Write a protein that binds this ligand. Structure first.
Ligand SMILES: CCCCCCCCCCCCCC(=O)SCCNC(=O)CCNC(=O)[C@H](O)C(C)(C)COP(=O)(O)OP(=O)(O)OC[C@H]1O[C@@H](n2cnc3c(N)ncnc32)[C@H](O)[C@@H]1OP(=O)(O)O
Ligand SMILES: CNCc1nnc2ccc(-c3ccc(F)cc3OCCc3c(C(=O)N4CCOCC4)nn(C)c3C)cn12
Ligand SMILES: [Cl-]
Length: 385
């Protein structure tokens, strides 16, 4: 309601509205020379720590911080449990900066209690392509909440990003902040029906008994696209063209280089899954989803919901519904308990037919130091991890 920190930032106020003809920074003509070279002050006993995510132990420290203190669902059934290998993948995209992986340590115990990260990427917003920082994994230890640490983390990473002559950022959050460019409800498609019911996430009733639910969400183990296969390095050029052509229709997408295609789509077990359909030497269809377990809080039987998240999907030889049906089948074949997707790109058009259930909240999309018209989530063409 007050937004005492955010109203000091170059972001729209809660009731700011810009028309289609506006697509520019809040603050332009920025000079790297003018960026502060001193780190932001922390409370005494706390220190900045540049994390080396390629070091296993530094990476484990981030993993522990997030495992115990990161995002929980609105009902506190779940907490995200990003794997250490996933964090490596998420944070070492091409041209990434290790100095954008910022930790705060409590000196007395030498333990990480705060973290924020960013990676650089070209973001096309309303047909204008801007080098941006993609901010993610902001986390403050549960014991230090509501002490205004997050503004310090946000301001410090803003400074480090500005030092690289980058003045815009993209980020997402479940909380409402000034001010979303788009707002995206999330949906789920049950796969391990019995498990989702036992943990308390899915519901039954007289019409949907346990056995009828199991039958309803059972899938045929046959791809609509017969030759969908795991992506290999030979497909990077093909995927780059297919996805790149698909994404230009949207109001907000990342302009991937081939190097970025290789990093973000070549498969890593329990991290990122991409399947392709090659015809006549061309990649004509692609499915991708990443692995993001939710820890199941307090649950005696299960400690982990193995969830797959829809990443990027393009079809030219099938319908989008058949493609996503295959996406669900491919996630099941890989032992995921649930398939999750946002109402971005074409996704909403298949949610009813493919038996998705609507979730309880939404993911908001944001830009930093950019004013433009907002848009319905079907015009969003980017998924942040
Ligand atoms: C050009 C370069 C630009 C780079 C910067 C681009 C912007 C990047 C911004 C970051 C993108 C992150 C993307 C993701 O990672 S989204 C993931 C966010 N992380 C979690 O939800 C994990 C669980 N929660 C926590 O760890 C803490 O609660 C956090 C760290 C979230 C808040 O800490 P705490 O609870 O101890 O509060 P405080 O007293 O320190 O801070 C209070 C202030 O913080 C504002 N707040 C609350 N939640 C968020 C949020 N998700 N994004 C931005 N701001 C947020 C809040 O409105 C208030 O400001 P104001 O209301 O008074 O104004
Ligand atoms: C974007 N960067 C990370 C990030 N930051 N904030 C958020 C908020 C939402 C989401 C989110 C995004 C897409 C999606 F499709 C579902 C999503 O969230 C489901 C709610 C949920 C669940 C959950 O209900 N489930 C059951 C089904 O399987 C998955 C786990 N668990 N948690 C821990 C959450 C937050 C990501 N967010
Ligand atoms: Cl098959």
């Amino acid at each position: 309601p007050d937004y005492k920190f955010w109203y000091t930032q170059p972001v729209p106020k809660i009731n700011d509205e810009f028309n289609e003809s506006v697509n520019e920074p809040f603050i332009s003509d920025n000079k790297v020379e003018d960026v502060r070279k001193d780190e932001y002050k922390l409370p005494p006993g706390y220190s900045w720590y540049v994390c080396d995510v390629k070091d296993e132990k530094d990476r484990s420290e981030i993993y522990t911080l997030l495992t115990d203190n990161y995002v929980e669902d609105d009902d506190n059934i779940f907490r995200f449990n990003y794997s250490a290998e996933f964090l490596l993948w998420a944070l070492t995209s091409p041209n990434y900066l290790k100095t954008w992986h910022i930790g705060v340590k409590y000196d007395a115990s030498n333990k990480l209690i705060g973290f924020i990260s960013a990676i650089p990427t070209d973001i096309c917003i309303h047909k204008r392509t801007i080098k941006m920082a993609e901010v993610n994994f902001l986390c403050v230890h549960k014991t230090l909440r509501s002490k205004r640490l997050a503004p310090v983390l946000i301001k410090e990473i803003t400074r480090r990003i500005n030092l690289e002559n980058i003045w815009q950022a993209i980020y997402t959050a479940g909380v409402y902040l000034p001010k979303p460019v788009s707002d995206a409800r999330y949906y789920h498609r049950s796969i391990n029906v019995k498990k989702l019911i036992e943990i308390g996430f899915s519901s039954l009733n007289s019409r949907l008994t346990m056995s009828r639910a199991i039958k309803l969400y059972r899938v045929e183990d046959t791809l609509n696209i017969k030759n969908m296969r795991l992506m290999k390095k030979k497909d990077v050029e093909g995927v780059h063209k297919l996805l790149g052509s698909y994404l230009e229709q949207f109001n907000l997408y990342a302009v991937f280089t081939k190097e970025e295609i290789a990093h973000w789509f070549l498969p890593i077990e329990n991290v990122i899954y991409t399947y392709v359909n090659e015809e006549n030497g061309k990649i004509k269809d692609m499915i991708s989803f990443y692995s993001l377990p939710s820890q199941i809080l307090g649950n005696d039987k299960y400690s982990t919901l193995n969830a797959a998240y829809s990443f990027y999907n393009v079809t030219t030889t099938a319908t989008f519904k058949q493609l996503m049906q295959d996406a669900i089948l491919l996630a099941k074949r890989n032992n995921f308990d649930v398939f999750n997707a946002l109402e971005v790109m074409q996704n909403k058009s298949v949610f009813e037919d493919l038996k998705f259930g609507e979730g309880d909240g939404s993911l908001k999309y944001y830009l930093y130091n950019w004013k433009c018209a907002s848009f319905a989530p079907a015009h969003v063409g980017i998924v942040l991890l």
